[PDB]
């Protein structure tokens, strides 16, 4: 808990997994594209407004 006060002080973001390196990747790629589509919606609205 003292290494984490070094990491979180100078803005390091620890990624604890504790389940699998193949089950979180699916639930995280199910958010990357789901948020990239919101980028492609709002930036299309931006270029429509401009």
């Amino acid at each position: 808990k003292k290494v984490k006060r070094v990491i979180d002080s100078l803005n390091g973001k620890i990624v604890s997994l504790n389940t699998r390196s193949s089950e979180l990747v699916d639930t995280l790629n199910r958010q990357i594209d789901d948020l990239q589509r919101i980028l492609d919606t709002t930036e299309q609205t931006l270029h429509t407004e401009l």
């Binding site: 919101i38 492609d40 919606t41 709002t42 609205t45």
Partner: peptide, 20 residues
């Protein structure tokens, strides 16, 4: 997000981005 009109996509983008 992809549904036609400025307001639909606009309002929709603002709604999703908040949940995210």
């Amino acid at each position: 997000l992809n549904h036609s009109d400025s307001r639909v996509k606009y309002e929709a983008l603002k709604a999703t981005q908040a949940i995210i």
